[PDB]
Structures are given as structure tokens and as C-alpha cells.
Coordinates of C-alpha atoms in Angstrom, one line a residue:
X1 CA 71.4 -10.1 -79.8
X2 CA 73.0 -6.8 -79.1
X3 CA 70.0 -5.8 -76.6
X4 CA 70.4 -8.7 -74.8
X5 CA 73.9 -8.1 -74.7
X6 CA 73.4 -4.9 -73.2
X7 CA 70.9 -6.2 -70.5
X8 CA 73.5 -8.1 -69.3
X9 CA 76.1 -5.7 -68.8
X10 CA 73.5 -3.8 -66.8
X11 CA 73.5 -7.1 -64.6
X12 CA 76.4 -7.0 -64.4
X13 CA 77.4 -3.9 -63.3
X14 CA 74.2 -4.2 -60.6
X15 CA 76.4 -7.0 -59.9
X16 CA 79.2 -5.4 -59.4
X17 CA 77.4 -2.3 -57.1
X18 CA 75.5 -5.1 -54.7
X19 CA 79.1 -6.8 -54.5
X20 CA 80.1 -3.4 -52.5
X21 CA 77.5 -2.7 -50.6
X22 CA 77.3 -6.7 -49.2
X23 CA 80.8 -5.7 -48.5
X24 CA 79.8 -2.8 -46.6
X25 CA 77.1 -4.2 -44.8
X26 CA 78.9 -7.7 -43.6
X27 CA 81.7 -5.1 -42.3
X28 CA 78.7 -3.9 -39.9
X29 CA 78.7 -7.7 -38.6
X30 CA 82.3 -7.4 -37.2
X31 CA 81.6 -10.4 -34.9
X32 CA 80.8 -12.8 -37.9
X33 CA 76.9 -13.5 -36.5
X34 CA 75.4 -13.3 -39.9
X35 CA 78.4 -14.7 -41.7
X36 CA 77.2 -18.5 -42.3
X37 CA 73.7 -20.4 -42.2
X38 CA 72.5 -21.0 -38.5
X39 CA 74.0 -24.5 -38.2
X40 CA 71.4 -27.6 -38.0
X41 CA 73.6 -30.0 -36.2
X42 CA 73.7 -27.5 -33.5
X43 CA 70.4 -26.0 -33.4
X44 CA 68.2 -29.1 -35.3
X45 CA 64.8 -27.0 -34.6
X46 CA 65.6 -24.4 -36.4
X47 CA 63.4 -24.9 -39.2
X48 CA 60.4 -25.2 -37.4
X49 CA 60.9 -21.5 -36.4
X50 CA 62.5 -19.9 -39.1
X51 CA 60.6 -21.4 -42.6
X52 CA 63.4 -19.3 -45.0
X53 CA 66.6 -19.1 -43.5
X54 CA 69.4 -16.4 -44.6
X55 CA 72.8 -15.1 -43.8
X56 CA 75.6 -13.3 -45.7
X57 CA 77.5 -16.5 -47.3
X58 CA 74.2 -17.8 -49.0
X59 CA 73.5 -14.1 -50.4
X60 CA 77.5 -14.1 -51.8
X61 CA 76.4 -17.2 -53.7
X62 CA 73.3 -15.9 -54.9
X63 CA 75.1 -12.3 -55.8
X64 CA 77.8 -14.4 -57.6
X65 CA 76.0 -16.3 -59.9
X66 CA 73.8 -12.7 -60.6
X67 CA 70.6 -13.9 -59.1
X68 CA 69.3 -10.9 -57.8
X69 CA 67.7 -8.8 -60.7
X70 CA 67.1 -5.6 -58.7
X71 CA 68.1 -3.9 -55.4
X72 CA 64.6 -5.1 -53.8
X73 CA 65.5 -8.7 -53.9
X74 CA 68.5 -8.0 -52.5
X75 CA 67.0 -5.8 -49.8
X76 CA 64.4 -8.6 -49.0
X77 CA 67.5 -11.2 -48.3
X78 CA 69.0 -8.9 -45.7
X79 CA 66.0 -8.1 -44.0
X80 CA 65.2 -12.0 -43.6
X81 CA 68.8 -11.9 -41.7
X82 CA 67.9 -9.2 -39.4
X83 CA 64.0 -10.5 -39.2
X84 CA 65.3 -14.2 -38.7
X85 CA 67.4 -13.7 -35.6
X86 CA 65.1 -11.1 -33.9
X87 CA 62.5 -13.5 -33.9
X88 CA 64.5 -16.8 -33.5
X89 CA 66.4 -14.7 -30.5
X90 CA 65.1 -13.3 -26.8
X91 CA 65.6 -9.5 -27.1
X92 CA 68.0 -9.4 -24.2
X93 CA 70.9 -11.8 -26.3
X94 CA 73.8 -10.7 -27.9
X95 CA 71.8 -12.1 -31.4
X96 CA 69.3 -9.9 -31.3
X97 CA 71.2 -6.9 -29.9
X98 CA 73.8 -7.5 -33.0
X99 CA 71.0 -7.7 -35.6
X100 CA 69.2 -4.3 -34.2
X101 CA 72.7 -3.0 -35.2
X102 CA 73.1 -4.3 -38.8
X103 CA 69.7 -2.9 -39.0
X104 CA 70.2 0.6 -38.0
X105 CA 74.0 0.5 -39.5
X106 CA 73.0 -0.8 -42.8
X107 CA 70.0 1.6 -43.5
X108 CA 72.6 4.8 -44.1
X109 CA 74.3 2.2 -46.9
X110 CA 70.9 0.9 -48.4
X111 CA 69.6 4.8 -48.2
X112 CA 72.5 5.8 -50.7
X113 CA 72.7 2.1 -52.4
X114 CA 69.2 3.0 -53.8
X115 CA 69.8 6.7 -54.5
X116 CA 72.8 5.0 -56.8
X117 CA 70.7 2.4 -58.8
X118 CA 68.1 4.6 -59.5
X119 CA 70.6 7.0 -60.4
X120 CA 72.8 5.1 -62.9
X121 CA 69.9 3.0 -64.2

């Protein structure tokens, strides 16, 4: 139908906005912490501490195949990166001292990001 036709080019371009602003949060991760899943050959405990893992490549797959519906979802992934580490890490590591900067970095892009979708529709 043509309304669902039109739903999905408002996925798309959602899509399309989320695409740049992951771009411009994972630029607030210059040291590549968040880049990849916290590796279970090399820490094998992780799941017993952290029960819903999430870094910046799982949320590229997700954004590619247009699995998040809204901004909230996508806002709810990033925070599990920040939330994950400053748990899973000792306040005085480099982990959680880089995540406490995506935090406070990212929130001027998510500010406007929602300003934007709320905006355009």
C-alpha cells in the first residue's frame, strides 16, 4: 500500500539521521573502547556481570537492517554501552573514565538529535 510505503520512507530517513549521529558519537570514542563486543575469550565472566551486553558495531548492525523504530531505542542501546562499562569497570580505569566521557560528549549530540526527530517527524 501507498501508506505503508510512506512509513517506510520515514524509516528510512530515521535511518538515515541515526546513521549520523552513531557517526558522531563513535567519533567521541577516539580510542576505539566501545568499538566491538567485550571479547569472551578474554574476559569469559563477562556475562555473569553484564546480562545485555552492547557496543558500537552490534548497534551498526541493528541501525543497518532498520531495527530501531524510534530515537528511544536507540538511546537505550548507548546508554547500556556507557552503563555496561561503568559497572563492569573500577572508577579509577581508563574504561570507566572513557565512558563518563562518551556520556557527557554525547549528550550535546542526543540533545539536538531529539530536537531533529521531533522536528522533522
Amino acid at each position: 500500500s501507498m501508506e505503508q510505503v510512506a512509513m517506510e520512507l520515514r524509516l528510512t530517513e530515521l535511518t538515515r539521521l541515526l546513521r549520523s549521529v552513531l557517526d558522531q558519537l563513535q567519533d567521541k570514542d577516539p580510542a576505539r573502547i566501545f568499538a566491538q563486543p567485550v571479547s569472551l575469550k578474554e574476559v569469559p565472566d563477562y556475562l555473569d556481570h553484564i546480562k545485555h551486553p552492547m557496543d558500537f558495531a552490534t548497534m551498526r548492525k541493528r541501525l543497518e537492517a532498520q531495527g530501531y523504530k524510534n530515537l528511544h531505542e536507540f538511546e537505550e542501546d548507548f546508554d547500556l554501552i556507557i552503563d555496561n562499562c561503568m559497572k563492569y569497570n573500577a572508577r579509577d580505569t581508563v574504561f570507566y573514565r572513557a565512558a563518563v566521557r562518551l556520556r557527557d560528549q554525547g549528550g550535546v549530540v542526543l540533545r539536538q538529535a531529539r530536537r531533529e526527530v521531533d522536528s522533522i517527524g
